[PDB]
Each structure stands twice: as C-alpha cells, then as structure tokens.
Design a protein around this ligand. Sequence first.
Ligand code: GG2
Length: 115
Amino acid sequence: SSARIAKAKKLIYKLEKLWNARDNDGILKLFKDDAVFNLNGVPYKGKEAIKKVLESAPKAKYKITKIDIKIVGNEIIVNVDVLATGPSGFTLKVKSTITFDEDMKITSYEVNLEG
Ligand SMILES: COc1ccc(-n2nc(C(N)=O)c3c2C(=O)N(c2ccc(N4CCCCC4=O)cc2)CC3)cc1
C-alpha cells in the first residue's frame, strides 16, 4: 500500500516523459483496457478510444509542478498540476487527476484545461 504511493509518484514522472516523447504505445500500457480518459469534460472509454486521443494530442511539452497523492478505498488518486507549453511558447496551467488501482494500472485519467 505504501509502495503503491511511491509507484504512483514514479509513474507520474514516467508519464511526463512519455507524454513529451509522444510514446502513445507506452502511455496506453499503463491504462486499463477499459479505462476512461476525461478530456475536458468529454470522456473517452476504451483503449482504442484513449489511443485515438493520444496521437491527436497537440504538439506540447509538459512539466510537472505539483503532485498530490490521495487514497480513497483501494484506489490511488493522484492530482497533478502540469504546465503545458505549445510550440509558440503559449503556456497553459492544466490539471490532471489520475486514478490507479491495485494493479498500478490507470482506471481514470482526467485532464482539466480550463484552469
Ligand atoms: C499549450 O496549451 C495546451 C492546451 C491544451 C493541450 N491539450 N490538448 C489536448 C487535446 N485536445 O487532446 C490534451 C492537452 C493536454 O494538456 N494533455 C496533457 C495534460 C497533462 C499531462 N500530464 C503531464 C505529465 C504527467 C501528468 C499529466 O497528466 C499530459 C498531457 C493531453 C490532452 C495542450 C497544450
């Protein structure tokens, strides 16, 4: 249970590298096959749907600035404050809520782009 908190912290920084590397194949492997990707209010359920959003994600570099890990039941809730940089230098304070289960696989992944 304590290792799960540490595993979650490492998987967040791993996700940051995969996102900036556009390793969409690797990103999916941490996802449960029936996970939900809530992209600013629009949920995308299923590996095939989460995928299509990954390769359609805009060209952007991400830097983690704050990580909060909460435990609710048997699920690891990770709230990540991210700064997303576009090629034009446009910077947006985005927020992500990632949920892990016992298998350390992502069950829910919500990206908030409003602020
Ligand atoms: C320049 O400003 C922007 C604005 C919007 C967008 N934008 N567009 C989409 C889309 N229309 O698909 C998505 C994003 C985004 O910001 N996404 C993301 C959010 C957060 C993370 N990170 C960082 C690593 C660890 C935690 C974590 O969750 C990784 C990717 C994916 C989706 C980009 C740039």
